[PDB]
């Protein structure tokens, strides 16, 4: 099973990179988005606590979530 | 669409990671207790008692830890 775990971690790192590039290109404002989403999930609260600077937490937040200020963050 | 595409791929990665770590008998709660002081993602994952697979995945990606055999 260990090859599968390692493979999935590799795919996660690739997705995080792709997500960072795509949201940056769309001018996502993480702090305004996360202020709106923080009460909605544990991931969003954690992402706001890191000021939006932790892309894996930003990604988990968006995947978990009509929020104002989230244009370009999807 | 590029952001939405990445989000779709993320959901597939989370499913596979859950299946793979379960097949590898990952002991999430003990692993996260060992890692919780190491990163914001790990402290958040422990706060959800390991039940939040996206937070578990972010923790493992960000992090000699006891109990983490099969989680990485």
Residue numbers in the entry:
A (entry chain B): 1 to 65, 69 to 77
B (entry chain A): 3 to 65, 69 to 77
Task: Reproduce text from the manuscript describing this model.
The most abundant virulence factor secreted by Hc yeast cells is Calcium Binding Protein 1 (Cbp1), which is absolutely required for macrophage lysis. The mature secreted form of Cbp1 is 78 amino acids in length, has no known domains, and, prior to this work, had only one known homolog in the closely related fungus Paracoccidioides. The Cbp1 structures displayed an alpha-helical dimer arrangement with an intermolecular four-helix bundle fold at the core formed from the 3rd and 4th helices of each monomer, creating a binocular shape, and thus we dubbed this new arrangement as a “binocular” fold. For both Pb03 and H88 Cbp1, the three disulfide bonds present in each monomer orient the alpha helices so that the aromatic residues (Phe12, Phe19, Trp30) are packed in the interior of the protein, creating the hydrophobic core.
Additionally, we have previously shown that the Paracoccidioides americana (Pb03) homolog of Cbp1 is capable of fully restoring lytic capability when expressed in a Hc cbp1 mutant background, suggesting that Hc is not the only species that could be using Cbp1 to elicit host cell death. Mass spectrometric analysis of Pb03 Cbp1 revealed two signal sequence cleavage sites, which likely explain the doublet on SDS-PAGE. Crystals of Hc H88 and Pb03 Cbp1 homologs formed after a week and diffracted to 1.6 Å. To resolve the phases, a heavy atom derivative was prepared by soaking the Pb03 crystals in K2PtCl4. The structure of Pb03 was truncated at C-terminal residues 65–67 from chain A and 67–68 from chain B, as the remaining amino acids were not resolved in the refined density. The asymmetric unit for the Pb03 Cbp1 crystal contained a single dimer, whereas the asymmetric unit for the H88 crystal contained a dimer of dimers. An alignment of the Pb03 and the Hc CBP1 dimers gave an RMSD of 1.6 Å, indicating the structures of the distinct homologs are conserved. The Pb03 structure has a clear negative charge at the C-terminal end of the protein and was partially positive at the interface between the N-terminal helices. Interestingly, only the Pb03 (and not H88) structure shows partially negative N-terminal helices. Using a N-terminal FLAG-tagged Pb03 Cbp1 homolog that retains its lytic capability during infection, we confirmed the cytosolic localization of Pb03 Cbp1 via this subcellular fractionation approach.
